[PDB]
Short mmCIF file of C-alpha atoms and ligand atoms in Angstrom, two decimals:
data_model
loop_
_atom_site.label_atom_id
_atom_site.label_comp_id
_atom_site.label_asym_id
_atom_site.label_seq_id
_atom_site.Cartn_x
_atom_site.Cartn_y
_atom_site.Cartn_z
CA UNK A 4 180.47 77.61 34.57
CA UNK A 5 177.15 78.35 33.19
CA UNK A 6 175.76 75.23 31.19
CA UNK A 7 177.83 72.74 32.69
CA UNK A 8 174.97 70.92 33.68
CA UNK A 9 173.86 69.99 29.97
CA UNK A 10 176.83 67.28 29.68
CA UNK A 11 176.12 64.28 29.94
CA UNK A 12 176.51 62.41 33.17
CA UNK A 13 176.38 58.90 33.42
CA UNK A 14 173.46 56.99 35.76
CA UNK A 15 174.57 55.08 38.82
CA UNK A 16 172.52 53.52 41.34
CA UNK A 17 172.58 56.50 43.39
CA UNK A 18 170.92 58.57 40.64
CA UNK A 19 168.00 56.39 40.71
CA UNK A 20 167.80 56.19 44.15
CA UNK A 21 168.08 60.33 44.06
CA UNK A 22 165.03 59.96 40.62
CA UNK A 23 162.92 57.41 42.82
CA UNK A 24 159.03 59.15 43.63
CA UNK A 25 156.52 61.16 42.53
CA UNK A 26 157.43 63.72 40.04
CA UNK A 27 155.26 66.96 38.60
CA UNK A 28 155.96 68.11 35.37
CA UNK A 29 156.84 72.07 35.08
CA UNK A 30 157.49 73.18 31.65
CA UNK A 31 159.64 71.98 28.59
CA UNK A 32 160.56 74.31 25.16
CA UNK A 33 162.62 72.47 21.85
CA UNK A 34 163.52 73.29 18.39
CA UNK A 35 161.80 69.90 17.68
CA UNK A 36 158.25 70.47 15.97
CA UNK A 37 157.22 66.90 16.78
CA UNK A 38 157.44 67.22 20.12
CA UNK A 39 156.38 70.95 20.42
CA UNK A 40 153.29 69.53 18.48
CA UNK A 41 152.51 66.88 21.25
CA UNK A 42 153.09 68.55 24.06
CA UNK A 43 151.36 71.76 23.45
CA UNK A 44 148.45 69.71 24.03
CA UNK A 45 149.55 68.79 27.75
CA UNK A 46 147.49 70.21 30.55
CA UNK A 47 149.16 68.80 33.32
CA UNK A 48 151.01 65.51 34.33
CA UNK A 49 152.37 63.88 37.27
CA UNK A 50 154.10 60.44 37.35
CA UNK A 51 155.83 57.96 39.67
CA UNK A 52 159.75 56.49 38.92
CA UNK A 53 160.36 53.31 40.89
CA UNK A 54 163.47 52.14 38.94
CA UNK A 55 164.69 48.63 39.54
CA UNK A 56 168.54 48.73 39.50
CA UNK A 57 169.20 44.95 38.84
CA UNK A 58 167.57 45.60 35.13
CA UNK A 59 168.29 49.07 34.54
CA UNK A 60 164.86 49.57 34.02
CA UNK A 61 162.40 52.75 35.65
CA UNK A 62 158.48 51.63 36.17
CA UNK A 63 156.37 54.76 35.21
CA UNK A 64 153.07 55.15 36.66
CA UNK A 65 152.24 58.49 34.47
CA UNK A 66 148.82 60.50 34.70
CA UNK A 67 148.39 63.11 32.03
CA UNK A 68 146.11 65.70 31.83
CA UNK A 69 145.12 66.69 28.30
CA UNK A 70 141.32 68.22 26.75
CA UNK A 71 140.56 68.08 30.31
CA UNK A 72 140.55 64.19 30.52
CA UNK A 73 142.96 61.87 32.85
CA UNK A 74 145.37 59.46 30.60
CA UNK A 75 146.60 56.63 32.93
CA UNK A 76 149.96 54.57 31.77
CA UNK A 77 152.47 52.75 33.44
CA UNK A 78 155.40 51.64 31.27
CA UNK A 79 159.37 50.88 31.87
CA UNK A 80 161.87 53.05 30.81
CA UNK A 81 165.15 51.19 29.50
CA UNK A 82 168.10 52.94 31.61
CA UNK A 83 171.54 53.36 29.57
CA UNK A 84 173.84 54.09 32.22
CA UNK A 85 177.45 55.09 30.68
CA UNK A 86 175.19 57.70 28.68
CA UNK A 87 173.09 59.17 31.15
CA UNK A 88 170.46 58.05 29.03
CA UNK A 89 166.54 56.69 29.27
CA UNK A 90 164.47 55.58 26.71
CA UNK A 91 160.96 54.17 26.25
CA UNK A 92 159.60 53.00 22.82
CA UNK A 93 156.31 54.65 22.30
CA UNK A 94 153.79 54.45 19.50
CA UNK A 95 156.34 53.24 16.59
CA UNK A 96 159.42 55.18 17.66
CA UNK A 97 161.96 54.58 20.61
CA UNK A 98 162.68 58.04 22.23
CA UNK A 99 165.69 58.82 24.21
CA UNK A 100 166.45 61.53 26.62
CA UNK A 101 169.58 62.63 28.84
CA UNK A 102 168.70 62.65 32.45
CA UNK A 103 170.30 66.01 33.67
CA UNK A 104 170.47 68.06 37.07
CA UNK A 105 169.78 71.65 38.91
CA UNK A 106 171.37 72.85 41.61
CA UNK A 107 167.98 72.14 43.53
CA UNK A 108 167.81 68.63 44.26
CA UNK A 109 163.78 68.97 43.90
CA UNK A 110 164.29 69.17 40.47
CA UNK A 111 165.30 67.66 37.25
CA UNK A 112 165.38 67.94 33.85
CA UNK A 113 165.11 65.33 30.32
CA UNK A 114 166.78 66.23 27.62
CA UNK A 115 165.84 65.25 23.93
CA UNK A 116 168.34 65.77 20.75
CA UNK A 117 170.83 67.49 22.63
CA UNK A 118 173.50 66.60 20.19
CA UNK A 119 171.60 68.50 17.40
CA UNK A 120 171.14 72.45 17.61
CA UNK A 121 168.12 71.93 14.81
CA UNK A 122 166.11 69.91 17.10
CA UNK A 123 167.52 70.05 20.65
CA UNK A 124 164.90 70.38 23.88
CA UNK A 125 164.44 70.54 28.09
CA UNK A 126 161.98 69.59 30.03
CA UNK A 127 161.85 70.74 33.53
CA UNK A 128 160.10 68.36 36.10
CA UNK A 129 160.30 69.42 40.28
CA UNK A 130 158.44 67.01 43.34
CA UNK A 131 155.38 70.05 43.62
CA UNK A 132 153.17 71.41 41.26
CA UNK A 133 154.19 74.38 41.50
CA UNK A 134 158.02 76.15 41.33
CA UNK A 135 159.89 78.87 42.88
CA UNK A 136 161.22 81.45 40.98
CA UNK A 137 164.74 79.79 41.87
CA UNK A 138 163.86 76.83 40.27
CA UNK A 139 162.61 78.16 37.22
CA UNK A 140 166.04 80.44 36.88
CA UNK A 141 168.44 77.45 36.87
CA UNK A 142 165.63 75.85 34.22
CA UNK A 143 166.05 79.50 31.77
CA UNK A 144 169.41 79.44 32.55
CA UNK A 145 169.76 76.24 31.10
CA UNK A 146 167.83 77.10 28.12
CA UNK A 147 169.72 80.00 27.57
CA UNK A 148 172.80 77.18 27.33
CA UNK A 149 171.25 75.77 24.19
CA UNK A 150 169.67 79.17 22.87
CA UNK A 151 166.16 78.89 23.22
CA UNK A 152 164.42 82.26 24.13
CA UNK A 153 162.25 81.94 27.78
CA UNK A 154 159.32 82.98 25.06
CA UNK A 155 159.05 79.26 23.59
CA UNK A 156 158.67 77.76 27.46
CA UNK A 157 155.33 75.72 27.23
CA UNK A 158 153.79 75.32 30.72
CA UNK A 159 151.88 72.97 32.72
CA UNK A 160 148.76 74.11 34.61
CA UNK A 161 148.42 72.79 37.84
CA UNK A 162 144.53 74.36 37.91
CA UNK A 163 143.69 72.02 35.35
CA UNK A 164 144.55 68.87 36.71
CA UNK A 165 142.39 65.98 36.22
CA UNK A 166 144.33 63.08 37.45
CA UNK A 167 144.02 63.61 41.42
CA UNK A 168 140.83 61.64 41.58
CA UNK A 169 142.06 58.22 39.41
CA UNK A 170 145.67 58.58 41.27
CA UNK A 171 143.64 58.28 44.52
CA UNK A 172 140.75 55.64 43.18
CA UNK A 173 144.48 53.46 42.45
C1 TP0 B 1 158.44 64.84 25.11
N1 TP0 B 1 159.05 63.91 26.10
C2 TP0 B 1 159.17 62.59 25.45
C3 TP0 B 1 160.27 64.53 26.67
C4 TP0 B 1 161.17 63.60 27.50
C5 TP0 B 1 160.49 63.13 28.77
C6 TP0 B 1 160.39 61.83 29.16
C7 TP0 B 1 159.66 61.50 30.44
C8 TP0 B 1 160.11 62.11 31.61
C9 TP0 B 1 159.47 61.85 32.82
C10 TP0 B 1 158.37 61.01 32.85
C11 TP0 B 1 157.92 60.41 31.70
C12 TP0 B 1 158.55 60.65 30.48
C13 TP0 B 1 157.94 59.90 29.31
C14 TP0 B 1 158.52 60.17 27.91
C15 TP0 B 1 160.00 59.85 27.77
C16 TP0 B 1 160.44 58.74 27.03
C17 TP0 B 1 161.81 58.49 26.95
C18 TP0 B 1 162.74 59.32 27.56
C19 TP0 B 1 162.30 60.42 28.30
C20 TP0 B 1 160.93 60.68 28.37
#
């Protein structure tokens, strides 16, 4: 059963234990221009979830890497658990996305509009830098699910990093 994993699955306490820690960001691809548009500009990121499960809330501790400068937030995400949902209002809109799952437990993917085919997206997040060709098959496998050719994949660079140094000055 080949995109099985792009239903929806709701978000117990167990998922955010299994979400909790550092995360790298890998690669995303949408039929969104928006947010093909902002994220082109992405270098690198990393980020921290440390959810508290009492108010379905996620703290984010995000450092992005963009015209080679380090862009410190931290932020809650609003958890919506019977729809495998989390969203975080961000200058003037709310944005949503579907938490969803590899095979690999090292990974895990967002995904954005995945009820419409004219704007649907994935982004692919795993706890190193770097993946292994494993990982990035179940990730192109699961774009193949929605249709979007391996070609549109925009990737971080881990050699660009700028973040290390204000992660470790925290
Ligand atoms: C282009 N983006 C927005 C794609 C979705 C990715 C995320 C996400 C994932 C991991 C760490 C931080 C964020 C911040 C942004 C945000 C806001 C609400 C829901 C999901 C998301």
């Amino acid at each position: 059963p080949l995109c099985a994993n792009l239903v929806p699955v709701p978000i117990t306490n167990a998922t955010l234990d299994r979400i909790t820690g550092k995360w790298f960001y890998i690669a995303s691809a949408f039929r969104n221009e928006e947010y093909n548009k902002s994220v082109q500009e992405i270098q690198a990121t990393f980020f921290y979830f440390t959810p508290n499960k009492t108010e379905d809330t996620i703290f984010l501790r995000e450092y992005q890497t963009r015209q080679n400068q380090c862009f410190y937030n931290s932020s809650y995400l609003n958890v919506q658990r019977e729809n495998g949902t989390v969203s975080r209002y961000e200058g003037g809109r709310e944005h949503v996305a579907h938490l969803l799952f590899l095979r690999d437990t090292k990974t895990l993917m967002f995904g954005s509009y995945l009820d419409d085919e004219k704007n649907w997206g994935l982004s692919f997040y795993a706890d190193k830098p770097e993946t292994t060709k494993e990982q990035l098959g179940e990730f192109y496998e699961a774009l193949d699910c929605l249709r979007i050719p391996r070609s549109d994949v925009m990737y971080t660079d881990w050699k660009k990093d700028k973040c290390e140094p204000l992660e470790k000055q925290h």
